[PDB]
Curated annotation (Swiss-Prot):
One of its GO terms (cellular component) is cytoplasm. The chain holds residues 3 to 445 of 557 of the full protein. An RNase that has 5'-3' exonuclease and possibly endoonuclease activity. Involved in maturation of rRNA and in some organisms also mRNA maturation and/or decay. This is Ribonuclease J 2. The gene is rnj2. Substrate binds at residues 363-367. Belongs to the metallo-beta-lactamase superfamily. RNA-metabolizing metallo-beta-lactamase-like family. Bacterial RNase J subfamily. It is found in: Cytoplasm. It comes from Staphylococcus epidermidis (strain ATCC 35984 / DSM 28319 / BCRC 17069 / CCUG 31568 / BM 3577 / RP62A).
Length: 442
């Protein structure tokens, strides 16, 4: 006669607000706690002797008996970079797409962590049933395939976390978004939407990837010597574009960086790339070709591309350095990174390299611009809105979009790390803080 109902909700960012990476959002529904993403951030300019930055999870450790799962939206560093460190401290099942799980398993192997982990590979048809709530998933579009949003069903309506996403009609297959499923979620009733603010300041739409690839062909066709493309190892779309263009221009492709080899190998075995025969060469073989017959994709050792480019520009790289007359395509900017980018570009000009200019007509990111964020807000029609994944100015820009779409302004929460947004069935409040912070890994 009595149906179980939910009473108290908590939403707590431990990473990803006040900054551009390191997503980690804790959602509690009564006595069940869920961790949404567990990303890393690369060290800020002002940091020395540091490899990566991860969230402080002391609040989760203090309450770990209630942690029911870790839910990972995609296989990029902003979503999974901290997972291995989390798993060394707490035990919970790990839920993610086929690709995301394979990349997490590789990361655990790479750090030689042998604890038993309960992985669950989910897809957009999966419904994971807990005591208090059910969790479902929906395909999103990103630069890595097999990305998923997370939908926590409550008796107040859904709590939806988008992860990182954009909308681009030129991406299909494992990049295609679940627009019909998202409309169903919005119609059934969304209590709170937690959405990516990274490009909320940028009007219009991201430039479609087909048009980006056309522009890359035109730029690459003009390069007279070697080309170095600097991008994230998780930018599979960009890697695929380079492979296609290299084939068209009779250039070979070689990977520089442990991050790329690893992620590419896994993704290739699983079928995620279209790779012509004889296109890929070992980095050791690059110097055996004419300069105009090679493209080097340079990701970082830990996945940070700019650090590797800086090493190459100063001729400090262990494996391969920049030479006069090389050309650079920089396919990666946050407040955290603006200084190293400026210094690296100066270093490259000093070394006699040629930076391929950005096209004014082109805006390339993995994150929705204003119209894409408004599309998500209009589909989901949330009662409350929590903009995340951004510096505070980005969160504010995203809050402005939500107000434009009709979210009540007093139901928009602009949060800092460690803030607790809480609901008791009557009022949504911001009246508590938990421990949070940046953990430095060396």
């Amino acid at each position: 006669l009595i149906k179980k109902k939910n009473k108290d909700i908590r939403i707590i960012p431990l990473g990803g607000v006040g900054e551009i990476a390191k997503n980690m959002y804790i959602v509690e529904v009564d006595d069940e706690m869920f961790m949404l993403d567990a990303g890393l951030m690369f060290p800020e300019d002002e940091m020395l002797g540091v490899d990566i930055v991860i969230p402080d999870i002391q609040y989760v450790i203090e309450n770990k008996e209630r942690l029911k799962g870790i839910f990972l939206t995609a296989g990029h560093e902003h979503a999974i970079g901290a997972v291995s460190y989390v798993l060394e401290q707490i035990d919970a099942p790990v839920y993610g797409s086929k690709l995301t799980i394979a990349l997490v398993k590789e990361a655990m192997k790479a750090r030689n962590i042998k604890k038993k982990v309960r992985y669950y590979t989910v897809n957009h048809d999966s419904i994971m049933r807990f005591k208090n709530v059910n969790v479902s998933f929906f395909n999103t579009t990103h630069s890595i395939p097999d990305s998923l949003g997370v939908c926590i069903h409550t008796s107040y309506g859904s709590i939806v976390y988008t992860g990182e996403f954009k909308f681009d009609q030129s991406l299909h297959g494992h990049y295609a978004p679940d627009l019909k499923r998202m409309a169903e979620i919005g119609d059934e009733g969304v209590f709170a939407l937690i959405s990516d603010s990274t490009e909320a300041e940028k009007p219009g739409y991201n430039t479609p990837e087909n048009i980006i690839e056309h522009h890359m062909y035109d730029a690459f066709a003009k390069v007279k010597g070697r080309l170095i493309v600097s991008c994230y190892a998780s930018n599979f779309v960009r890697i695929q574009q380079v492979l296609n263009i290299a084939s068209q221009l009779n250039r070979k492709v070689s990977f520089l960086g442990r991050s790329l080899e690893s992620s590419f190998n896994i993704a290739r075995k699983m079928g995620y790339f279209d790779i012509p025969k004889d296109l890929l060469i070992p980095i050791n073989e690059v110097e055996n070709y004419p300069k105009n017959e090679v493209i080097i994709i340079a990701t970082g050792m830990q996945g940070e591309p700019v650090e590797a480019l800086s090493q190459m520009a100063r001729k400090k790289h262990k494996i391969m350095n920049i030479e006069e007359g090389d050309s650079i395509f920089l396919a990666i900017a946050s407040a955290n990174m603006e200084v190293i980018i400026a210094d690296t570009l100066n270093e490259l000009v000093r070394a006699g390299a040629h930076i391929i200019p950005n096209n004014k007509k082109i805006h390339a990111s993995s994150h929705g611009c204003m119209e894409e964020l408004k599309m998500m807000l209009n589909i989901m029609k949330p009662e409350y809105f929590v903009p995340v994944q951004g510096e505070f100015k980005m969160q504010i820009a995203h809050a402005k979009l939500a107000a434009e779409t009709g979210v009540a302004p007093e139901k928009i929460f602009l949060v800092e790390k460690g803030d607790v947004i809480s609901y008791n069935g009557k009022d949504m409040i911001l009246n508590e803080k938990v421990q949070s912070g940046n953990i430095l890994i060396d």
